[PDB]
């Protein structure tokens, strides 16, 4: 399973441990998204940065929209079905299906940038940055509901 | 016309016995290299 | 401190020529020698005849990116290319039946620089 992580809070007034962990996760700025695998070594880091990010399990339709809209190559170039059909024998939908069901890695697409840069959510965050999603806020683990947010921020 | 180098032997020979060695070296070099 | 290069326009021209030659022929030795010549003057290479005789063979070709000095013997004949020679070094290399030449003439005689030994 692939997890999506979005950064929500700034690193000012935060510990160097957290800052460095976020740098290692490549989450340098706010409203930036990264996709990783649900391994224990990643879950530990997510638990360490639990209070500055949201995360959850992502869906293939959402990933396809994400690649079609906010995906970039070296040079900040858009991704196109031309390029995908050339470098691989697939379309974006099939690539996403695979990626989320194993059998394929995003970096298998040559010159793919590993960070997605989103605008802030339409209608706004409907919960405080100072609290967690469970108790009515915004931070921490959602489930499939990370896709609603990715849609609002796409 | 030539420019023989003799200070190389002046700085080596024991003083009070330099002009004789210089003359012998002059003759030797003139012979060999000319 | 700002590290300038050489003030000898002939050295500057040689460095540019070496880089162009490397790009033309598809080799690395000329670019290597160029960056070695762009080395600060206080660290410029100096080699004596003894070292060449020690680490060469008969019929070898050698390039020195600095100066060659006269101290030691030469027991066999070799070709030496360098930017500056001393009188004694030139004389001692001619004796033993070798040849002392310039890096430009070496580039002429051998564009690929195959078989050449760098000493520094």
């Amino acid at each position: 399973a692939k997890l999506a992580l979005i950064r929500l809070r700034s690193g000012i007034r935060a510990r160097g441990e957290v800052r460095d962990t976020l740098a290692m996760l490549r989450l340098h700025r706010i409203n930036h998204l990264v996709i990783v695998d649900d391994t224990p070594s990643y879950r530990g880091m997510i638990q360490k940065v639990k209070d500055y990010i949201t995360w959850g399990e992502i869906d293939k339709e959402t990933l396809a929209k994400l690649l079609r809209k906010r995906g970039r190559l070296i040079g900040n170039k858009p991704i196109t079905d031309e390029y995908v059909k050339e470098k691989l024998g697939m379309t974006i939908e099939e690539f996403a299906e695979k990626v989320v069901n194993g059998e394929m890695k995003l970096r298998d697409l040559p010159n793919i940038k590993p960070v997605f840069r989103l605008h802030p959510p339409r209608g706004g965050l409907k919960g405080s940055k100072k609290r967690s999603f469970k108790e009515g806020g915004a931070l921490g683990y959602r489930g499939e509901k990370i896709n609603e947010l990715i849609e609002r921020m796409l | 016309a030539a420019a023989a180098a003799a200070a190389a032997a002046a700085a080596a020979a024991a003083a009070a016995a330099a002009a004789a060695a210089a003359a012998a070296a002059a003759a030797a070099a003139a012979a060999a290299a000319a | 401190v700002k590290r300038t290069g050489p003030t000898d326009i002939n050295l500057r021209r040689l460095i540019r020529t070496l880089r162009k030659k490397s790009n033309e022929e598809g080799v690395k030795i000329w670019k290597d020698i160029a960056w070695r010549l762009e080395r600060p003057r206080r660290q410029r290479a100096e080699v004596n005849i003894s070292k060449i005789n020690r680490y060469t063979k008969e019929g070898d070709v050698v390039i020195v990116p600095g100066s060659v000095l006269g101290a030691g013997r030469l027991e066999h004949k070799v070709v030496v290319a360098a930017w500056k020679f001393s009188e004694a070094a030139r004389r001692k290399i001619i004796e033993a039946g070798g040849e002392a030449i310039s890096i430009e003439e070496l580039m002429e005689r051998n564009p690929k620089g195959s078989g050449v030994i760098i000493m520094e």
Binding site: - | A8, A9, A13, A14, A17, A25 | -
Partner: protein, 148 residues
């Protein structure tokens, strides 16, 4: 060649010329004393620099002999003989006797023959003293030592 400009020209407008606070560049107190003041022996404001970088500066050790009696003997090596052979031949130092090449070092004005470096030619070395290593190298090159 390279004629850079002085950095006062750049610091003109800097208000302290790189010395810090406007209290920092004053008389001898700002150095800790004048000269080697405080390097030990009565005061210890620089005893730390003394023990890190300048030991054997305080105190005496040994004695000196008079130069009226000092003599500096002159020495030469086999490498030097072999590397200057042809000049020693051109000028006297090496000469000819029956079937032999001889090296008279007293002429040169040397008292000792030391033993650094190979010897190639065969020779007869005429001199007061010679070191055993030089003896062996000479007798291997095929010569003799005749001591005066």
């Amino acid at each position: 060649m390279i004629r850079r400009r002085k950095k006062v020209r750049k610091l003109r407008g800097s208000h302290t010329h790189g010395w810090g606070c406007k209290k920092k560049h004053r008389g001898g107190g700002s150095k800790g004393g004048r000269g080697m003041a405080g390097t030990g022996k009565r005061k210890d404001q620089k005893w730390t620099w003394t023990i890190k970088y300048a030991p054997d500066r305080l105190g005496k050790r040994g004695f000196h002999r008079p130069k009226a009696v000092q003599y500096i003997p002159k020495v030469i090596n086999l490498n030097d003989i072999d590397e200057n052979f042809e000049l020693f031949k051109d000028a006297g130092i090496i000469y000819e006797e029956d079937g032999k090449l001889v090296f008279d070092a007293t002429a040169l004005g040397v008292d000792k023959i030391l033993g650094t470096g190979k010897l190639t030619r065969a020779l007869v070395v005429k001199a007061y003293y010679v070191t055993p290593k030089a003896e062996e190298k000479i007798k291997a090159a095929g010569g003799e030592v005749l001591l005066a």
